[PDB]
Amino acid sequence: TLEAIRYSRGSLQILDQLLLPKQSRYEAVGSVHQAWEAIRAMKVRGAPAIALVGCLSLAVELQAGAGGPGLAALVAFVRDKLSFLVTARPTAVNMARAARDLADVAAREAEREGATEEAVRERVICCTEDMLEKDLRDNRSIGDLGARHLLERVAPSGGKVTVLTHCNTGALATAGYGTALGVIRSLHSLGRLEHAFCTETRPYNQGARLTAFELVYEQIPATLITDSMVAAAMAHRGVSAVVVGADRVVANGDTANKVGTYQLAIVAKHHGIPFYVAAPSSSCDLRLETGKEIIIEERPGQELTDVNGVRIAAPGIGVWNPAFDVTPHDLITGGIITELGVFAPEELRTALTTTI
Amino acid sequence: TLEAIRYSRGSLQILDQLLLPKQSRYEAVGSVHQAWEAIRAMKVRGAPAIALVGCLSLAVELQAGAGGPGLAALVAFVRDKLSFLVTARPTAVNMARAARDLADVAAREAEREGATEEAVRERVICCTEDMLEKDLRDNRSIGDLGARHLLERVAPSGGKVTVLTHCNTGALATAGYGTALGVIRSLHSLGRLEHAFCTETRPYNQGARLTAFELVYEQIPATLITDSMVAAAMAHRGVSAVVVGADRVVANGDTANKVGTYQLAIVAKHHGIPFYVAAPSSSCDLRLETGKEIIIEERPGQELTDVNGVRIAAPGIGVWNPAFDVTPHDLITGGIITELGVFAPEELRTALT
Secondary structure: OOEOEEEEOOEEEEEOOOOOOOOOOEEEOOOHHHHHHHHHOOOOOOHHHHHHHHHHHHHHHHHOOOOOOOOHHHHHHHHHHHHHHHOOOOOOHHHHHHHHHHHHHHHHHHOOOOOOHHHHHHHHHHHHHHHHHHHHHHHHHHHHHHHHHHHHHHOOOOOOEEEEEOOOOOOOOOOEOOOHHHHHHHHHHOOOEEEEEEEOOOOOOHHHHHHHHHHHHOOOOEEEEOHHHHHHHHHHOOOOEEEEOOOEEEOOOOEEEEOOHHHHHHHHHHOOOOEEEEOOHHHEEOOOOOHHHOOOOEOOOHHHHEEOOEEOOOOOOEEOOEOEEEEOHHHOOOEEEEOOEEEOHHHHHHHHHHOO | OOOOEEEEOOEEEEEOOOOOOOOOOEEEOOOHHHHHHHHHHOOOOOHHHHHHHHHHHHHHHHHOOOOOOOOHHHHHHHHHHHHHHHHHOOOOOHHHHHHHHHHHHHHHHHOOOOOOHHHHHHHHHHHHHHHHHHHHHHHHHHHHHHHHHHHHHHOOOOOOEEEEEOOOOOOOOOOOOOOHHHHHHHHHHOOOEEEEEEEOOOOOOHHHHHHHHHHHHOOOOEEEEOHHHHHHHHHHOOOOEEEEOOOEEEOOOOEEEEOOHHHHHHHHHHOOOOEEEEOOHHHEEOOOOOHHHOOOOEOOOHHHHEEOOEEOOOOOOEEOOEOEEEEOHHHOOOEEEEOOEEEOOOOHHHHHO
């Protein structure tokens, strides 16, 4: 119901994150170029959402009858818009990945016997619409499967749970519903969520800005705390499970995620509560054997020292501003929640490649 | 060293913390009333510093020939200003503690045979100056004894250390030198400090504002990080020890301190590095046995949701803003550093009884 992407045939709107959280407002995305400019201006947030916004905007152009006339002029049209869509924010694989599928889908269809301009046009549109429903359905699965495994682990006989989360993994990082925040939604909709705790997530503040927003909007009983209150909250506020998202999960289950996650896992262990990572398999990168092989992005120190255009920190001080940390898999005590089920880290590699 | 208090007989100045960390400005305090206002204004921070600024301000007035005349007049004068000083900012009980003792000092001295007005005047000034020296010399023992113990524990083979700290515990929270930051200063003078890490310490941002300022000022090699960055810094930036301050230490060594401290202790233990609480014995409270007797103050949520007059947090979210958490003595693996030296939590009661 909370939608950062609104799409219907011939109609695409996006929620402008630049205006959040004071104001929630939608912007109409008329063209591939508008999507490109919106993605780059960071109105659209989350690699899976960014991918979906670019491809959906192509389908709007196609619905409008853009591309061609011809067919090879239309395949050419599609491939050009995608490779241009890949240019917007090559932060991540999602756009490039989706571009291949569709472009492959167009080619296979154009290469079909009796192929026409019209067949390719609709086919590309329909697969694009398949993508969107697929992300929504997947995120729903992560939330439901995650909520179920968690209840079985923590309160199997009935009884509510209190969940603490980190950064933003909800409707504002995805097509809709979210991952870790999806799990919270499912618990809540089952009437089994006592309370949700969300951290500020310095220095980019996605937890204070975006997660708090979603929880208020959903009228989910929630409390915001600082990153540094996480242990006290586990000790004195009855937290019984921790669920986080992932930037990247590697083959052994080591998980790169927004910084503070590795701290959360340590603190969860100490208070003996299960630590869950919730991520789609498209977020699991099975090339890397270990979290060692992950480069940690370091961002400019000013982004840590300054907030809202004003420097808070003392002048001259050195700064370390890693965007992420890596959580070793032995701390992922709850599991890794995917659209294909919840997995113990040692099981992840084999389960992803051998089950549908 | 950095001075938030510059005092000479007949001259008192204070660093204005409001203008930090962008500017350094020193303000004269010629009167008890002026000190009272600077304290209300929060130009002066740290309970021991507040108490000293007030007592020294009376000392400055007492140097002025102010108070009296007679003897019994001067005592009432001293006692009136001290009781007056307490009114400004009573959350810190250090001023109230100081007022009694000084009032007791003026009285005890007034009570001597052959008493003179002059003898009480000077005595009260001299006592005030002794108080300042004691705070300074005590904080220095905390730093020196802490650093020597920390080095023997962590780098017995020689070699430099990297220390991570939390909130502000330096010259800007004390009379000078500081406690946990005093330990970092002492490691630095010994040439044994590789680096210092200081946390932001949300939501009042003392580490970002004040600690960073102190470290830069002393040209101590230092790096500021967020509170959520602590685990990654231990694991990947070679932290060899954690040293923090204390709001309060109870008899078993359970320690109440600026929130996030309990988190640091957990994370420190994970990475197998010693956790140190640095606190003067005057901050150790033998009346409570156990951390379970400590009541945690919760501050207003707007102080967490807003930075610098602007709401960061989304509208309508509930907020928890405890000022402190309590660290169980089991996690204090380095020890408790007092002006007498480093104590294991279990040694502490008999050491201070």
